Coordinates of C-alpha atoms in Angstrom, one line a residue:
Chain M
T173 CA 122.6 75.8 99.3
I174 CA 124.4 76.8 102.5
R175 CA 125.8 80.0 100.7
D176 CA 122.3 81.2 100.1
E177 CA 121.3 80.0 103.5
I178 CA 123.7 82.5 105.1
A179 CA 122.6 84.9 102.4
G180 CA 119.0 84.3 103.6
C181 CA 119.5 84.4 107.3
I182 CA 121.8 87.5 107.1
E183 CA 118.7 89.8 107.0
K184 CA 117.8 89.0 110.6
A185 CA 119.1 90.6 113.7
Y186 CA 122.8 90.8 112.6
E187 CA 122.4 94.5 113.3
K188 CA 126.1 95.0 112.6
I189 CA 128.8 92.3 112.1
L190 CA 132.5 92.7 111.6
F191 CA 133.6 91.6 108.2
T192 CA 136.1 88.9 108.9
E193 CA 133.7 86.8 110.9
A194 CA 131.5 86.8 107.8
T195 CA 134.6 85.9 105.9
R196 CA 134.9 82.9 108.2
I197 CA 131.3 81.8 108.0
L198 CA 130.5 82.6 104.3
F199 CA 133.9 81.6 102.7
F200 CA 136.7 83.2 100.7
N201 CA 138.9 85.6 102.6
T202 CA 139.2 88.7 100.4
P203 CA 137.2 87.7 97.3
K204 CA 135.1 89.2 94.7
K205 CA 132.4 87.2 96.4
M206 CA 132.3 89.9 99.1
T207 CA 131.4 92.1 96.2
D208 CA 128.8 89.5 95.2
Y209 CA 127.2 89.5 98.6
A210 CA 127.6 93.2 99.5
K211 CA 126.2 94.2 96.1
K212 CA 123.8 91.5 95.0
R213 CA 122.6 91.4 98.6
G214 CA 122.3 94.6 100.6
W215 CA 124.6 94.8 103.7
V216 CA 126.4 98.0 102.7
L217 CA 130.2 97.5 102.6
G218 CA 131.1 100.3 105.0
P219 CA 134.0 100.4 107.5
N220 CA 134.7 96.8 108.5
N221 CA 131.0 96.2 108.9
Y222 CA 127.9 95.0 107.0
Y223 CA 125.3 97.5 108.0
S224 CA 121.7 96.6 108.7
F225 CA 118.9 98.7 107.2
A226 CA 115.5 99.0 108.7
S227 CA 112.0 98.2 107.2
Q228 CA 108.5 98.4 108.7
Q229 CA 105.0 97.2 108.1
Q230 CA 102.9 99.7 110.3
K231 CA 99.8 97.6 109.7
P232 CA 98.3 100.9 108.6
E233 CA 95.6 100.5 105.9
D234 CA 94.5 97.1 107.2
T235 CA 92.1 97.9 109.2
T236 CA 90.4 97.0 105.8
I237 CA 91.6 93.6 104.8
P238 CA 90.5 92.8 108.4
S239 CA 87.3 94.6 107.6
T240 CA 86.7 92.9 104.3
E241 CA 87.8 89.5 105.4
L242 CA 85.4 90.0 108.3
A243 CA 82.8 91.0 105.7
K244 CA 83.5 87.6 104.0
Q245 CA 83.4 85.7 107.3
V246 CA 80.3 87.3 108.8
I247 CA 78.5 87.2 105.5
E248 CA 79.4 83.5 105.8
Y249 CA 78.1 83.3 109.5
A250 CA 74.9 85.1 108.5
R251 CA 74.7 82.9 105.4
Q252 CA 74.8 79.6 107.2
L253 CA 72.5 80.9 109.9
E254 CA 70.4 82.4 107.1
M255 CA 69.8 78.9 105.5
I256 CA 66.6 78.0 105.1
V257 CA 66.6 76.2 101.8
Chain B
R281 CA 98.9 121.0 103.2
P282 CA 96.5 118.2 102.1
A283 CA 94.8 117.7 105.5
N284 CA 96.2 114.2 106.3
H285 CA 99.5 114.5 108.1
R286 CA 99.0 118.1 109.1
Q287 CA 99.9 118.4 112.8
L288 CA 101.9 121.7 112.7
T289 CA 104.8 122.5 115.0
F290 CA 105.9 125.9 116.4
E291 CA 108.5 126.4 113.7
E292 CA 106.5 127.0 110.6
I293 CA 104.1 129.3 112.5
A294 CA 107.0 131.3 113.9
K295 CA 108.5 131.4 110.4
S296 CA 105.4 132.5 108.5
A297 CA 103.9 134.8 111.1
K298 CA 107.5 135.9 112.0
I299 CA 106.6 136.2 115.7
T300 CA 108.6 134.9 118.7
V301 CA 108.2 131.7 120.6
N302 CA 105.9 132.7 123.5
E303 CA 103.5 134.6 121.3
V304 CA 102.4 131.7 119.0
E305 CA 100.2 130.3 121.8
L306 CA 98.4 133.7 122.0
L307 CA 98.2 133.6 118.2
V308 CA 96.5 130.2 118.2
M309 CA 94.3 130.7 121.2
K310 CA 93.1 133.9 119.6
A311 CA 91.9 132.0 116.6
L312 CA 90.5 129.4 119.0
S313 CA 88.6 132.1 120.8
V314 CA 87.3 133.4 117.5
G315 CA 86.6 129.9 116.0
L316 CA 88.6 130.0 112.8
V317 CA 90.4 126.9 114.0
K318 CA 89.0 123.9 115.7
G319 CA 92.1 122.1 116.9
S320 CA 94.2 121.5 120.1
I321 CA 97.7 121.9 121.5
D322 CA 100.5 119.8 122.8
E323 CA 103.5 121.7 124.0
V324 CA 106.2 119.1 124.6
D325 CA 107.0 119.7 120.9
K326 CA 104.7 122.8 120.6
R327 CA 102.7 120.8 118.1
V328 CA 99.4 122.6 117.5
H329 CA 97.0 119.8 116.3
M330 CA 94.8 120.6 113.3
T331 CA 91.3 119.2 113.0
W332 CA 90.0 122.1 110.9
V333 CA 90.4 124.1 107.7
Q334 CA 88.4 127.1 106.3
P335 CA 86.0 126.6 103.4
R336 CA 87.6 128.5 100.5
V337 CA 86.5 129.7 97.1
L338 CA 86.6 126.9 94.4
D339 CA 89.4 127.6 91.9
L340 CA 90.2 125.7 88.7
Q341 CA 92.6 123.3 90.3
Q342 CA 90.1 123.0 93.2
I343 CA 87.4 122.2 90.6
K344 CA 89.6 119.5 89.2
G345 CA 90.6 118.1 92.6
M346 CA 86.9 118.1 93.6
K347 CA 85.8 116.1 90.6
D348 CA 88.8 113.7 90.7
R349 CA 88.6 112.9 94.4
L350 CA 84.9 112.8 94.3
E351 CA 85.0 110.2 91.6
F352 CA 87.8 108.5 93.5
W353 CA 85.4 108.0 96.4
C354 CA 82.5 107.2 94.2
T355 CA 84.1 104.3 92.2
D356 CA 85.5 102.8 95.4
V357 CA 82.1 102.8 97.1
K358 CA 80.6 101.3 94.0
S359 CA 83.3 98.7 93.5
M360 CA 83.0 97.5 97.1
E361 CA 79.2 97.6 97.1
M362 CA 79.0 95.5 94.0
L363 CA 81.2 92.9 95.7
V364 CA 79.0 92.9 98.8
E365 CA 75.8 92.6 96.7
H366 CA 77.1 89.9 94.4
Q367 CA 78.7 87.9 97.3
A368 CA 75.4 87.9 99.3
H369 CA 73.0 88.2 96.5
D370 CA 71.8 84.6 96.0
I371 CA 70.8 84.2 99.7
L372 CA 68.7 87.3 99.4
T373 CA 67.4 85.6 96.1
Chain C
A1 CA 59.7 124.9 112.8
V2 CA 58.9 121.4 111.6
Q3 CA 60.5 118.2 112.9
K4 CA 59.3 116.0 110.0
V5 CA 56.0 115.4 108.1
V6 CA 54.2 112.2 108.4
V7 CA 52.5 111.2 105.1
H8 CA 49.9 108.5 105.1
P9 CA 49.2 106.2 102.1
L10 CA 45.7 107.6 101.6
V11 CA 46.9 111.0 100.3
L12 CA 49.4 109.4 98.0
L13 CA 46.7 107.2 96.5
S14 CA 44.6 110.4 96.4
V15 CA 47.3 111.8 94.1
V16 CA 47.4 108.7 91.9
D17 CA 43.7 108.7 91.4
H18 CA 43.9 112.5 90.7
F19 CA 46.4 111.8 87.9
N20 CA 43.8 109.3 86.7
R21 CA 41.2 112.1 86.9
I22 CA 43.1 114.4 84.6
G23 CA 44.8 111.7 82.5
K24 CA 42.2 112.0 79.8
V25 CA 42.8 115.6 78.9
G26 CA 46.4 114.6 78.6
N27 CA 47.7 117.5 76.5
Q28 CA 49.7 119.6 79.0
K29 CA 48.7 119.4 82.6
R30 CA 50.6 118.7 85.8
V31 CA 48.9 117.2 88.8
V32 CA 48.2 119.9 91.5
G33 CA 46.1 119.5 94.6
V34 CA 45.5 120.8 98.2
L35 CA 46.9 119.1 101.3
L36 CA 45.0 118.5 104.6
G37 CA 46.5 117.5 107.9
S38 CA 47.0 118.2 111.6
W39 CA 49.7 120.3 113.2
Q40 CA 50.4 117.7 115.9
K41 CA 53.7 118.8 117.3
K42 CA 57.0 120.0 115.9
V43 CA 56.3 116.8 113.9
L44 CA 53.5 117.2 111.3
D45 CA 50.6 114.9 110.6
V46 CA 48.7 114.4 107.3
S47 CA 45.3 112.7 107.0
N48 CA 43.4 113.8 103.9
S49 CA 43.7 115.8 100.6
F50 CA 41.7 116.8 97.5
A51 CA 41.9 118.5 94.2
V52 CA 42.1 122.1 92.8
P53 CA 41.7 123.6 89.3
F54 CA 45.0 124.6 87.9
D55 CA 46.5 125.2 84.4
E56 CA 49.6 126.6 82.8
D57 CA 50.3 127.6 79.2
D58 CA 53.4 128.1 77.1
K59 CA 53.8 131.8 76.3
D60 CA 54.6 134.0 79.4
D61 CA 54.9 130.9 81.6
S62 CA 53.7 132.5 84.8
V63 CA 50.0 131.8 84.2
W64 CA 48.6 130.0 87.2
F65 CA 45.2 129.5 88.8
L66 CA 44.2 128.8 92.4
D67 CA 40.4 128.9 92.9
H68 CA 39.8 130.4 96.3
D69 CA 36.1 129.7 96.2
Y70 CA 36.6 126.0 95.5
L71 CA 38.9 126.0 98.6
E72 CA 36.3 127.9 100.6
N73 CA 33.3 125.7 100.0
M74 CA 35.1 122.3 99.9
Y75 CA 37.0 123.1 103.0
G76 CA 33.6 124.0 104.4
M77 CA 32.5 120.5 103.5
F78 CA 35.5 118.8 105.0
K79 CA 35.4 121.0 108.1
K80 CA 31.6 120.2 108.3
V81 CA 32.2 116.5 108.3
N82 CA 35.4 116.6 110.4
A83 CA 36.4 119.3 112.8
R84 CA 39.6 117.6 113.9
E85 CA 40.8 118.0 110.3
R86 CA 42.0 121.3 109.0
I87 CA 44.3 122.6 106.3
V88 CA 48.1 122.4 106.5
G89 CA 49.2 123.1 102.9
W90 CA 49.3 121.9 99.3
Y91 CA 51.0 119.6 96.9
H92 CA 51.7 118.9 93.2
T93 CA 53.0 116.1 91.1
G94 CA 56.6 117.3 91.4
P95 CA 58.9 116.0 88.6
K96 CA 60.9 118.7 90.2
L97 CA 59.9 122.2 91.3
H98 CA 60.0 124.8 88.6
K99 CA 60.2 128.6 88.9
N100 CA 56.4 129.2 89.2
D101 CA 56.3 126.9 92.3
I102 CA 56.6 129.7 94.8
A103 CA 53.5 131.6 93.9
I104 CA 51.1 128.8 95.2
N105 CA 52.6 129.0 98.7
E106 CA 52.7 132.8 98.4
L107 CA 49.0 132.7 97.7
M108 CA 48.0 130.3 100.5
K109 CA 50.2 131.6 103.3
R110 CA 47.1 133.5 104.3
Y111 CA 45.4 130.2 105.1
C112 CA 48.1 128.2 106.8
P113 CA 50.9 130.2 108.7
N114 CA 53.5 127.7 107.5
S115 CA 51.9 126.3 104.3
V116 CA 53.9 123.2 103.7
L117 CA 54.2 121.5 100.3
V118 CA 54.6 117.9 99.2
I119 CA 56.5 116.7 96.1
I120 CA 55.7 113.1 95.1
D121 CA 56.2 111.1 91.9
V122 CA 53.3 109.3 90.2
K123 CA 55.9 107.4 88.1
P124 CA 57.7 105.0 90.5
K125 CA 61.0 105.0 88.6
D126 CA 62.3 106.7 91.7
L127 CA 64.4 104.1 93.5
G128 CA 64.6 106.6 96.3
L129 CA 62.0 107.5 98.9
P130 CA 59.1 109.5 97.4
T131 CA 56.9 112.2 99.1
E132 CA 59.5 114.9 99.3
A133 CA 58.4 117.9 101.4
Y134 CA 59.8 121.5 101.4
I135 CA 59.1 124.5 103.5
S136 CA 59.8 128.1 102.6
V137 CA 62.2 130.2 104.8
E138 CA 64.5 133.1 104.3
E139 CA 68.3 133.0 104.5
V140 CA 69.3 136.6 103.6
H141 CA 72.7 136.5 102.1
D142 CA 76.1 138.1 102.8
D143 CA 76.1 139.5 99.3
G144 CA 73.3 141.8 100.2
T145 CA 70.5 140.0 98.5
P146 CA 67.3 141.8 99.8
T147 CA 65.3 138.7 100.7
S148 CA 66.0 135.2 99.3
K149 CA 62.8 133.3 100.0
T150 CA 63.8 129.7 99.4
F151 CA 62.0 126.4 100.0
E152 CA 63.9 124.0 102.2
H153 CA 63.3 120.3 102.7
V154 CA 62.2 118.8 106.0
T155 CA 62.5 115.0 106.0
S156 CA 59.5 112.7 105.4
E157 CA 58.4 109.1 105.5
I158 CA 55.2 107.0 105.5
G159 CA 53.5 106.7 108.8
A160 CA 51.1 104.2 110.3
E161 CA 47.5 104.1 111.4
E162 CA 45.5 101.1 112.7
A163 CA 42.8 101.0 110.0
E164 CA 45.2 102.0 107.2
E165 CA 47.4 99.1 108.3
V166 CA 44.4 96.8 107.6
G167 CA 43.9 98.5 104.3
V168 CA 47.5 98.5 103.0
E169 CA 48.6 95.2 104.5
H170 CA 45.6 93.6 102.9
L171 CA 46.0 95.4 99.5
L172 CA 49.5 94.0 99.1
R173 CA 49.3 90.2 99.4
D174 CA 52.3 90.3 97.0
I175 CA 55.8 90.0 98.5
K176 CA 57.1 88.9 101.9
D177 CA 60.7 87.7 102.1
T178 CA 61.5 89.2 105.5
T179 CA 60.8 86.6 108.2
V180 CA 61.9 89.5 110.3
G181 CA 65.3 88.9 111.9
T182 CA 68.8 88.7 110.5
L183 CA 67.6 89.1 106.9
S184 CA 64.7 91.6 107.0
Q185 CA 67.4 94.3 106.8
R186 CA 69.8 92.8 104.1
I187 CA 67.7 93.8 101.1
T188 CA 67.8 97.3 102.5
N189 CA 71.5 96.7 103.1
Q190 CA 72.0 96.4 99.4
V191 CA 69.7 99.4 99.1
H192 CA 71.8 101.6 101.4
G193 CA 75.0 101.2 99.4
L194 CA 73.2 101.4 96.0
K195 CA 71.2 104.5 97.1
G196 CA 74.3 106.2 98.4
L197 CA 75.6 105.5 94.9
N198 CA 72.7 107.0 93.1
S199 CA 72.9 110.2 95.2
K200 CA 76.7 110.4 94.6
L201 CA 76.1 109.9 90.9
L202 CA 73.8 112.9 91.1
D203 CA 76.6 114.7 92.9
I204 CA 79.4 114.0 90.4
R205 CA 77.0 114.8 87.5
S206 CA 76.2 118.1 89.2
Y207 CA 79.8 118.9 89.8
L208 CA 80.7 118.2 86.1
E209 CA 77.7 120.1 85.0
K210 CA 78.4 123.3 86.9
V211 CA 81.7 123.8 85.2
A212 CA 80.1 123.5 81.8
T213 CA 76.7 125.3 82.1
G214 CA 75.0 127.6 84.4
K215 CA 77.5 130.2 83.1
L216 CA 79.3 130.0 86.5
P217 CA 76.5 128.6 88.7
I218 CA 78.7 126.6 91.0
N219 CA 76.5 127.3 94.1
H220 CA 78.8 130.1 95.2
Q221 CA 78.2 129.7 98.9
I222 CA 77.2 126.2 99.7
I223 CA 79.7 124.6 97.3
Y224 CA 82.8 125.6 99.3
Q225 CA 81.1 125.4 102.6
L226 CA 79.6 122.0 102.4
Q227 CA 82.4 120.7 100.2
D228 CA 84.9 121.5 103.0
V229 CA 82.5 119.9 105.4
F230 CA 82.9 116.8 103.1
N231 CA 86.7 117.4 103.1
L232 CA 86.8 117.7 106.9
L233 CA 85.1 114.4 107.8
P234 CA 86.4 111.3 106.0
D235 CA 88.3 109.8 109.0
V236 CA 90.6 107.1 107.7
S237 CA 93.2 107.5 110.5
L238 CA 95.1 104.5 111.9
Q239 CA 96.1 105.1 115.5
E240 CA 93.2 103.7 117.5
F241 CA 90.7 103.2 114.7
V242 CA 92.8 100.1 114.3
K243 CA 92.2 99.5 118.0
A244 CA 88.4 99.4 117.7
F245 CA 89.0 95.9 116.4
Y246 CA 89.4 94.1 119.7
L247 CA 86.0 95.6 120.5
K248 CA 85.1 94.1 117.1
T249 CA 86.5 90.8 118.5
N250 CA 84.3 91.4 121.6
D251 CA 81.3 91.9 119.3
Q252 CA 82.3 88.5 117.7
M253 CA 82.9 87.0 121.1
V254 CA 79.4 87.0 122.7
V255 CA 77.6 85.8 119.7
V256 CA 80.2 83.1 119.0
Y257 CA 79.9 81.6 122.4
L258 CA 76.1 82.0 122.6
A259 CA 75.7 80.2 119.2
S260 CA 78.3 77.6 119.8
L261 CA 77.0 76.7 123.3
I262 CA 73.2 77.0 123.1
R263 CA 72.4 76.3 119.4
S264 CA 74.1 72.9 119.4
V265 CA 72.5 71.9 122.8
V266 CA 69.0 72.8 121.6
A267 CA 69.4 71.0 118.3
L268 CA 70.8 68.0 120.2
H269 CA 67.9 68.0 122.6
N270 CA 65.5 68.0 119.7
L271 CA 67.5 65.1 118.2
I272 CA 67.0 63.3 121.6
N273 CA 63.2 63.8 121.4
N274 CA 63.1 62.8 117.8
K275 CA 65.1 59.6 118.2
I276 CA 63.2 58.6 121.4
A277 CA 59.9 59.0 119.6
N278 CA 61.4 57.3 116.6
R279 CA 62.7 54.1 118.1
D280 CA 59.9 53.8 120.7
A281 CA 57.3 54.1 118.0
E282 CA 59.4 51.8 115.7
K283 CA 59.3 49.0 118.3
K284 CA 55.5 49.4 118.4
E285 CA 55.0 49.8 114.7
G286 CA 57.2 47.1 113.2

């Protein structure tokens, strides 16, 4: 549960890390567990470095889940102000 | 290009029209003078921005894209309107 | 030209009773009558209307009758009783317009310079807005059509008058859910979505129908033109159209703090008055 704890917190701002410090922290000096992490995980086994890929959200379409959750919420405001029985 | 991410740069203009760099501005402002384009121009990248396309004769694939995208809009409007109506229907009553 | 026409309820009821006039012959007869009004402005006004004899048979279906003399003497009557009132056009029942529905206007253009028509529906299955009105103009085409003389619609509604308010608003007595405020518009808020849907259903049905029949109808000018108008304005972009939503937060802001502050205080003050008059009459009652 610490092995997958490093394998969870790897994906953060370790934008590049040299391999033998990950050998120190993870465990197992030159294992096939480096194949396990570098293949079951991402962190492309390049030259002496687990490389960090990039991913984005953009908040593009939504704009609409804001608009429809506001449809829900203001239909609710109007609904409770609406009541009369 | 399907009119969504269509901001054109200098290169494809100078590649299609096969004219040099300092003539594409004349080329686009001539069409802006005529009015068979309704866009605008940045020149840090020489991106000529597109807010326009010409109405063109409906072909068979244009027939199909017409019906398909028109239905695409119609069923979305219907499916959201039904949810609005049903969500606030019983307070109308 | 015309801004819009203003139809009063009296002429529409004057069409309904006219259908009741000719509902006993039954066999094959559309409702056709003559429209009266007042050219007020670029907007148009409608006050009165009346009948006309008209028939149409099956073989050589261009057989149509407009009595000039009926028009002469009965317009003499209506001009004799009211000089403010004069002719503005004509009407008929209008399921739709058929091919023979140009010759009526082409007769009575020598009475009104712009003889406007009104298309209604006596059968209120229309969940749209009745009293359609066209006007005939010319649009002479790039293909070298000599003269295309086409009716074109100018928008319409039902207007108001002080006495007809008394009339209509007493003749209803039927339905009033409005309590005009935040909810007098929500029934019509269902209506605007649903009645964009009906029109769009007509659109998709027409688009599917032009490919099958009409032999190649497809509208040939105003399909690609107004279709590209459609295909030039669904803005779903995401650069600052996202950034209208702190103005949406500002829209929320004012009403949130007005409600939260003043609503609670007013209801509380009324609780104060109620509980004072409750306990101070309780100590006198019990």
